[model samples]
Target: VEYEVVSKNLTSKMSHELLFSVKKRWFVKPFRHDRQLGKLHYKLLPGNYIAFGLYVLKNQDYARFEIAWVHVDKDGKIEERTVYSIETYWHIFIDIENDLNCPYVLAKFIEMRPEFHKTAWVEESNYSIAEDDIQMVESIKRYLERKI
Candidate 1:
């Protein structure tokens, strides 16, 4: 149940256009397949939003799950972001069921070619839920602030 966060580039005009262009890409098309069946399409307007993807691996071998375009605001306060907001800071929760060997993903992400070098890693186990999430969010905020 370890998690890794990777910041993908939205820099350059080509890269920026690609983000919007991906709305029609195969992987994203499935999420919109039911548009005629009351499905809806969504798009991101270009702005100061940083997009990240999360990959969860079990025992560092197989990828258990993955999430894409987990957004974070480049110019907003952490408190201003909500759990429902794409711009909200992310925290990976790994419980007892999560296999080990999932460390280093996040740290490596931050260290290696991050689109921006302002993100932090935080972990918590058990009853420290509130404190842990808050702290992790704050850490990300501080890191982004430094970059700002």
Candidate 2:
């Protein structure tokens, strides 16, 4: 089920600490619905983001991750400012799923997108997992890093 970019904004003035010091006001928007990552809602910048709801691509489930940069807007309309953070697409072909070096796989993935980019996009193939479940990518990275 495709989710909508949470319809909220950070308008108004004097938004001192929240907008500047905190990740919630500037980086991520917190909503009650998304209990996982603070229930913060987002629109993927994508591996190309700038992530304004890309018109559903023809190959929704081609089997790969769209890694990119992430940003937020104060317009209250778009939250993830994908343009600056979008990165190239990464692959995880099922054809050779088992013969994988899981740790290297994850490190490469995370390392590919640096924190300097502010935020990132790591959505696997559309059909690979649930829309709101990209966190698995990180989970695998951690486990793999430790094991590898």
By TM-score, who's the top model here?
A: 2
Task: After superposing candidate 2 on the true structure, give the runs of residues whose Cα lies further than 4 Å from its correct spot.
Answer: 1-64, 74-92, 95-100, 103-148
Candidate 1 per-residue lDDT over residues 1-148, each given as its tens digit: 1112222232220011011112221111112212122222333332322222332232332221222333423443222122221222222322211424322332333332223222222222122222233343444444433422
lDDT of 2 at 96: 24
Model 2 lDDT per residue over 88-144, tens place: 112322222443554333333333231221222333322222222234335543453
- Provide the TM-score for each candidate, comma-separated: 0.21, 0.22
> CA lDDT of 30 in candidate 2?
21
Model 2 — which ten-residue stretch has the worst lDDT? 13-22
Candidate 1 ranges with C-alpha deviation above 4 Å: 1-42, 61-92, 95-138, 141-148
Question: Which one wins on lDDT?
Answer: 2
Which lDDT value does model 1 have at 126? 25
Q: Cα deviation in Å at residue 60, candidate 1? A: 2.4
- The TM-score obtained by model 1 is 0.21
Q: How close is candidate 2 to the true structure, as a TM-score?
A: 0.22
Q: Please estimate how well model 2 matches the true structure, expressed as its whole-model Cα lDDT.
A: 0.27
